[PDB]
């Protein structure tokens, strides 16, 4: 299944404050109105990672709780694993030997700890530095990812140096979710009076956006 | 494909004339730039930001920095000269009497309003509403404040209303405003009884045409485009000069304090000379384009000063110099970085066709009109003033003789009266 | 007189060199972390890495002293890129990646940015734009052994060259032709690694050398590895020189309502200079405003008439420099006057100055002219009963001197 | 000081040539501002590195001069076009244009030559001794309204 991404998937590009300004930047962004893959966990196959990922899920029930990343997923290299279970965060990179059908059951060079709603996330891995961004919002639409704009703040950067070409998501076992890929687009970002990114233009979308 | 205008076969023939039987008083706005913002740049602080290390390298380039400050100082002094040459054409600050008995013409919307925190007119306040520093860049104030510019437009306007053109040639001589307007009618070749016999109409047409200026300015934000374009070009030039401080020009960083906090002198100098080279070229490109832009504003101020003299302090015979139609009069209003002229013109309005002749035969003598055209309603022949239909009986006193009927191509037989 | 290069000065107003408020104190701020950085875990380990499989050590959340390294006689090479070693103790970085391995004494030439050859392309690749230091020492006494120390390995072959920092540890057979290798050595099919086998009989070029490449994570992100420098109390509402985490600048600091989100560390201007900071010892946002500056103009009657003078600090406030405030700036040495006259020397915003009685420079609002109510009425006219003939001069320039410049003789003589 | 517009054109052109000659003494980052000093101290490979810093800066110094002389020539041309118009309209004619040829009602003008310029002596009639009167737009007679010619 597929859906329109609309203007979703913008994030704060750098750790610098700006306000009441229009600012132009080139980075891995999800293009406006791009084509997003869609799944229903009541459905967690392995997917390619490309240059980076936008991920989102619908919420009323806490089914979806984590992710796996790597190249072969079979102990031949360090594989990033993330859990965020709605009370705790746990992160690991060991040479795990996952089975062909893993779930969260209801060498480790790094380790770390810390529908009514839509949860949004962005993952990117430039030179194996795994950066993460996210957002949450209430929603009115039961079926699908609604049209709107709200930028994602950074959460974490992992200095792990890991090559990723494949990834997967983890269900809790004894909901609608989404995947789309980032591209090296130029964007014009609007920073408001309170320094929030409140709107953007994808400069390659159409000739008016290029104008 | 664009259309140039509606096609018109003019109804020409060798004996047909069209004479206008009525007129309209137009008032039309002209907007001219007169000055631009007086910027100054400390080129040492722009290029080197109070680094002593960069400051000593910038001395290797000699007098490039003082001649950039000399060029911008010449541009800045010239903006006050441009303003003085347009507005300071009065020697005395004239004022209107407390009784506005101008024969029904109503100047209240262009004369000063004492309720305002600066004494601008109502139209000068619309003009001031419809048009809109850290890196060694600074803005210097103009010599004449907007309060002083509004006193000059007030004196020019009050001299023109109370004394006509006389305050331009010498001392202001009072003249009643309808008698001054009767002189303006003689100046376009309309006989002055046409004003006195139509005075109440001419005043209503003038007062209505000033009301249309208020409505246009109180709605049409594109109207002052020439002044906003001059404001916008100077802002875009400064934003370009400031953003060029963020360029590397091939150094390791554009931030001069990164190089000076990361590298020792011998390696820092190699990086700083790239920033000096590119920033010096950035500032030379700005000053060169501000010199070319200043020359364009000076040409517009020289035109605005010539329109003040020839259109406000006088009445102009020059076609389309003081608006479209025959010039009667003009009024200056102040605007941000410029001047607005309200040009008052006579436009002929309602043609009728007539048969016409070059001369008339009477007693075999050829008679020609002294100051008019010979014209016929189809049966009778009259002499008319050339710019307004007012037919008179053909007489020895409104005509003159030369020779006999054998010579003139198209002469007509009609009686000439002897009083 | 020096600005005009003249002993006589004509009447006027002349700009002379600019005024700047100088920094009153120097302020220094760094995070209050106390850990000494773990560099001994890299430089003084008994074991070391093979260059085909180099070890990256993360250095973070600590106080360094890089001078302990470059003061030492122990190092056979100490190159640095994007930084000088002498300056490292003033800086602070988000992380250091200390990459570490053994190579032969000749191969130090391949441990540099943008290089090629067996070590650079098949073992350890530095980028075109490296920021860091490469530190090497001879380790013959640590890493040679009789019969050969075979514990140190290098990749001899790869099917394509590595990207920067691409840590390929694969032992899969190198294929030199169309011949299938079946995971074993054979015809056109070779193991991709070899061993250095170091012996104490080897010469200075073929001896083992230990290498550390300190690579700096230099970013807008918060810093965690700082040099050994002190930090001060903070200062506000005063022009100061300042340093936050190595971000050196100068200005007036104040508290501010700039609403930094919890991940933001700095604010930037249109020139990409910094216009706010977050302090590394308290989560407080400081606005930065430049120390006050302006042109200084000297207002003079001509030296033919007086040596008295007045001075204008353009756009400055008189609290920052008779003394009088104007919209043009602070005006000093000019007597303010409530009479108004023609504009003799222009100052700006309707202010002018002249030399007058007590003979001194005076400053006043200019008079536009005498004020005249014209005697208008609906039936009064004035008619001139006599005339005067005026002859008035007008001067216009028509030409300028016709110069020519042989640019080959100007430039090259 | 009455001749100041012509002296200002002399002074600006003199100051531009003195600025252009002073810029020969600048190093622009070379070891010396003297070209024979570089060539008598250094061998060809190292001398050409120093000479190209002088060439770069002296070429920029001369481009700056010729650019501001082009901009100044356009201002002198505008003034000469105006002077040629005042010659035709006020020496060869009698202008009706207000304040084009002095204040007052223009009678006549005389050209006088001056260094790099022209001086016009403009002769004008100025009305000088007013008297006030009552006035009327028209006069009644036998019910006829009369207006002055
Ligand atoms: C996404 O791609 C599929 C084909 O892969 C197409 O049918 C669908 O219309 C596309 N949707 C959008 C939003 O472009
Ligand atoms: C989240 O994970 C922790 C262990 O990391 C566990 O103790 C906790 O109960 C989990 N919470 C939920 C809501 O599953
Ligand atoms: C750790 O590395 C060794 C080889 O060095 C490998 O055998 C082992 O499987 C790795 N650990 C895990 C958790 O796979
Ligand atoms: C900015 O934040 C303030 C509260 O700090 C709020 O009142 C205001 O409405 C916000 N403005 C915008 C444009 O979001
Ligand atoms: C004048 O006469 C011609 C006769 O053909 C006619 O076409 C034209 O419309 C007339 N114009 C006016 C103003 O009466
Ligand atoms: C106009 O032309 C006609 C012929 O079409 C001629 O008979 C007549 O005399 C001419 N009239 C004038 C006034 O030229
Ligand atoms: C040290 O810094 C932290 C914030 O980073 C702050 O909470 C603490 O009060 C500081 N202590 C001292 C003595 O500076
Ligand atoms: C110079 O000053 C003297 C008196 O000291 C005076 O006679 C002369 O006219 C002055 N000239 C000028 C140009 O000021
Ligand atoms: C000058 O500074 C004082 C504070 O010392 C302030 O009250 C005043 O408004 C300032 N005036 C100007 C023109 O800056
Ligand atoms: C000028 O007049 C004002 C009152 O209008 C007065 O306050 C001020 O002190 C006077 N200045 C001088 C220099 O006398
Ligand atoms: C003309 O009359 C007015 C009446 O107020 C008077 O002020 C003015 O001085 C008179 N002028 C002459 C020249 O008589």
PDB file of N, CA and C in Angstrom, chain B residues 11-50:
ATOM      1  N   UNK B  11     -11.150  62.229 -39.110  1.00  0.00           N
ATOM      2  CA  UNK B  11     -12.114  62.630 -40.145  1.00  0.00           C
ATOM      3  C   UNK B  11     -11.674  63.839 -40.996  1.00  0.00           C
ATOM      4  N   UNK B  12     -10.434  63.836 -41.477  1.00  0.00           N
ATOM      5  CA  UNK B  12      -9.814  64.924 -42.222  1.00  0.00           C
ATOM      6  C   UNK B  12     -10.466  65.169 -43.587  1.00  0.00           C
ATOM      7  N   UNK B  13     -10.645  66.440 -43.934  1.00  0.00           N
ATOM      8  CA  UNK B  13     -10.845  66.918 -45.298  1.00  0.00           C
ATOM      9  C   UNK B  13     -10.364  68.362 -45.405  1.00  0.00           C
ATOM     10  N   UNK B  14     -10.135  68.847 -46.617  1.00  0.00           N
ATOM     11  CA  UNK B  14      -9.569  70.168 -46.869  1.00  0.00           C
ATOM     12  C   UNK B  14     -10.459  71.368 -46.480  1.00  0.00           C
ATOM     13  N   UNK B  15     -11.650  71.166 -45.913  1.00  0.00           N
ATOM     14  CA  UNK B  15     -12.503  72.245 -45.409  1.00  0.00           C
ATOM     15  C   UNK B  15     -13.237  71.925 -44.099  1.00  0.00           C
ATOM     16  N   UNK B  16     -12.890  70.849 -43.396  1.00  0.00           N
ATOM     17  CA  UNK B  16     -13.532  70.445 -42.142  1.00  0.00           C
ATOM     18  C   UNK B  16     -12.626  70.730 -40.952  1.00  0.00           C
ATOM     19  N   UNK B  17     -13.167  71.348 -39.901  1.00  0.00           N
ATOM     20  CA  UNK B  17     -12.476  71.594 -38.633  1.00  0.00           C
ATOM     21  C   UNK B  17     -13.311  71.088 -37.466  1.00  0.00           C
ATOM     22  N   UNK B  18     -12.678  70.544 -36.433  1.00  0.00           N
ATOM     23  CA  UNK B  18     -13.335  70.230 -35.170  1.00  0.00           C
ATOM     24  C   UNK B  18     -12.910  71.219 -34.088  1.00  0.00           C
ATOM     25  N   UNK B  19     -13.867  71.868 -33.425  1.00  0.00           N
ATOM     26  CA  UNK B  19     -13.604  72.822 -32.339  1.00  0.00           C
ATOM     27  C   UNK B  19     -14.268  72.303 -31.065  1.00  0.00           C
ATOM     28  N   UNK B  20     -13.585  72.310 -29.908  1.00  0.00           N
ATOM     29  CA  UNK B  20     -14.129  71.803 -28.662  1.00  0.00           C
ATOM     30  C   UNK B  20     -15.097  72.807 -28.047  1.00  0.00           C
ATOM     31  N   UNK B  21     -16.292  72.362 -27.685  1.00  0.00           N
ATOM     32  CA  UNK B  21     -17.366  73.230 -27.174  1.00  0.00           C
ATOM     33  C   UNK B  21     -17.414  73.322 -25.648  1.00  0.00           C
ATOM     34  N   UNK B  22     -16.538  72.591 -24.962  1.00  0.00           N
ATOM     35  CA  UNK B  22     -16.465  72.428 -23.514  1.00  0.00           C
ATOM     36  C   UNK B  22     -15.059  71.933 -23.152  1.00  0.00           C
ATOM     37  N   UNK B  23     -14.698  71.961 -21.880  1.00  0.00           N
ATOM     38  CA  UNK B  23     -13.397  71.542 -21.354  1.00  0.00           C
ATOM     39  C   UNK B  23     -13.561  70.676 -20.109  1.00  0.00           C
ATOM     40  N   UNK B  24     -12.476  70.041 -19.691  1.00  0.00           N
ATOM     41  CA  UNK B  24     -12.354  69.427 -18.375  1.00  0.00           C
ATOM     42  C   UNK B  24     -11.037  69.831 -17.727  1.00  0.00           C
ATOM     43  N   UNK B  25     -11.051  70.167 -16.438  1.00  0.00           N
ATOM     44  CA  UNK B  25      -9.835  70.389 -15.651  1.00  0.00           C
ATOM     45  C   UNK B  25      -9.333  69.049 -15.124  1.00  0.00           C
ATOM     46  N   UNK B  26      -8.181  68.591 -15.601  1.00  0.00           N
ATOM     47  CA  UNK B  26      -7.501  67.416 -15.059  1.00  0.00           C
ATOM     48  C   UNK B  26      -6.570  67.818 -13.931  1.00  0.00           C
ATOM     49  N   UNK B  27      -6.454  66.981 -12.904  1.00  0.00           N
ATOM     50  CA  UNK B  27      -5.311  66.974 -11.983  1.00  0.00           C
ATOM     51  C   UNK B  27      -4.660  65.603 -12.073  1.00  0.00           C
ATOM     52  N   UNK B  28      -3.374  65.536 -12.399  1.00  0.00           N
ATOM     53  CA  UNK B  28      -2.635  64.272 -12.538  1.00  0.00           C
ATOM     54  C   UNK B  28      -1.383  64.291 -11.688  1.00  0.00           C
ATOM     55  N   UNK B  29      -1.062  63.176 -11.056  1.00  0.00           N
ATOM     56  CA  UNK B  29       0.105  63.029 -10.186  1.00  0.00           C
ATOM     57  C   UNK B  29       1.342  62.646 -10.983  1.00  0.00           C
ATOM     58  N   UNK B  30       2.481  63.263 -10.709  1.00  0.00           N
ATOM     59  CA  UNK B  30       3.801  62.793 -11.120  1.00  0.00           C
ATOM     60  C   UNK B  30       4.690  62.592  -9.901  1.00  0.00           C
ATOM     61  N   UNK B  31       5.354  61.449  -9.789  1.00  0.00           N
ATOM     62  CA  UNK B  31       6.236  61.108  -8.669  1.00  0.00           C
ATOM     63  C   UNK B  31       7.674  61.036  -9.163  1.00  0.00           C
ATOM     64  N   UNK B  32       8.609  61.687  -8.475  1.00  0.00           N
ATOM     65  CA  UNK B  32      10.031  61.677  -8.817  1.00  0.00           C
ATOM     66  C   UNK B  32      10.882  61.387  -7.580  1.00  0.00           C
ATOM     67  N   UNK B  33      11.832  60.438  -7.632  1.00  0.00           N
ATOM     68  CA  UNK B  33      12.890  60.326  -6.637  1.00  0.00           C
ATOM     69  C   UNK B  33      13.774  61.572  -6.606  1.00  0.00           C
ATOM     70  N   UNK B  34      14.247  61.968  -5.432  1.00  0.00           N
ATOM     71  CA  UNK B  34      15.086  63.162  -5.229  1.00  0.00           C
ATOM     72  C   UNK B  34      16.346  62.826  -4.451  1.00  0.00           C
ATOM     73  N   UNK B  35      16.284  61.891  -3.522  1.00  0.00           N
ATOM     74  CA  UNK B  35      17.419  61.486  -2.704  1.00  0.00           C
ATOM     75  C   UNK B  35      17.379  59.985  -2.452  1.00  0.00           C
ATOM     76  N   UNK B  36      18.438  59.446  -1.874  1.00  0.00           N
ATOM     77  CA  UNK B  36      18.481  58.090  -1.349  1.00  0.00           C
ATOM     78  C   UNK B  36      19.158  58.093   0.020  1.00  0.00           C
ATOM     79  N   UNK B  37      19.038  57.010   0.780  1.00  0.00           N
ATOM     80  CA  UNK B  37      19.596  56.915   2.135  1.00  0.00           C
ATOM     81  C   UNK B  37      21.111  57.129   2.141  1.00  0.00           C
ATOM     82  N   UNK B  38      21.594  58.009   3.027  1.00  0.00           N
ATOM     83  CA  UNK B  38      23.014  58.351   3.188  1.00  0.00           C
ATOM     84  C   UNK B  38      23.717  57.269   4.003  1.00  0.00           C
ATOM     85  N   UNK B  39      24.167  56.194   3.375  1.00  0.00           N
ATOM     86  CA  UNK B  39      24.978  55.168   4.044  1.00  0.00           C
ATOM     87  C   UNK B  39      26.430  55.612   4.185  1.00  0.00           C
ATOM     88  N   UNK B  40      27.110  55.048   5.170  1.00  0.00           N
ATOM     89  CA  UNK B  40      28.549  55.139   5.372  1.00  0.00           C
ATOM     90  C   UNK B  40      29.045  53.771   5.822  1.00  0.00           C
ATOM     91  N   UNK B  41      30.224  53.352   5.374  1.00  0.00           N
ATOM     92  CA  UNK B  41      30.827  52.070   5.751  1.00  0.00           C
ATOM     93  C   UNK B  41      32.233  52.317   6.259  1.00  0.00           C
ATOM     94  N   UNK B  42      32.545  51.947   7.494  1.00  0.00           N
ATOM     95  CA  UNK B  42      33.932  51.874   7.950  1.00  0.00           C
ATOM     96  C   UNK B  42      34.585  50.626   7.352  1.00  0.00           C
ATOM     97  N   UNK B  43      35.304  50.764   6.241  1.00  0.00           N
ATOM     98  CA  UNK B  43      35.844  49.633   5.490  1.00  0.00           C
ATOM     99  C   UNK B  43      36.822  48.782   6.310  1.00  0.00           C
ATOM    100  N   UNK B  44      37.534  49.349   7.284  1.00  0.00           N
ATOM    101  CA  UNK B  44      38.387  48.561   8.178  1.00  0.00           C
ATOM    102  C   UNK B  44      37.548  47.674   9.080  1.00  0.00           C
ATOM    103  N   UNK B  45      36.439  48.162   9.630  1.00  0.00           N
ATOM    104  CA  UNK B  45      35.558  47.340  10.456  1.00  0.00           C
ATOM    105  C   UNK B  45      34.731  46.351   9.633  1.00  0.00           C
ATOM    106  N   UNK B  46      34.314  46.694   8.414  1.00  0.00           N
ATOM    107  CA  UNK B  46      33.670  45.734   7.519  1.00  0.00           C
ATOM    108  C   UNK B  46      34.621  44.589   7.163  1.00  0.00           C
ATOM    109  N   UNK B  47      35.830  44.889   6.680  1.00  0.00           N
ATOM    110  CA  UNK B  47      36.776  43.864   6.223  1.00  0.00           C
ATOM    111  C   UNK B  47      37.352  43.063   7.400  1.00  0.00           C
ATOM    112  N   UNK B  48      37.773  43.728   8.480  1.00  0.00           N
ATOM    113  CA  UNK B  48      38.560  43.132   9.565  1.00  0.00           C
ATOM    114  C   UNK B  48      37.904  43.061  10.948  1.00  0.00           C
ATOM    115  N   UNK B  49      36.736  43.652  11.190  1.00  0.00           N
ATOM    116  CA  UNK B  49      35.961  43.419  12.418  1.00  0.00           C
ATOM    117  C   UNK B  49      36.674  43.718  13.744  1.00  0.00           C
ATOM    118  N   UNK B  50      37.594  44.682  13.771  1.00  0.00           N
ATOM    119  CA  UNK B  50      38.471  44.984  14.920  1.00  0.00           C
ATOM    120  C   UNK B  50      39.477  43.872  15.315  1.00  0.00           C
TER     121      UNK B  50
END
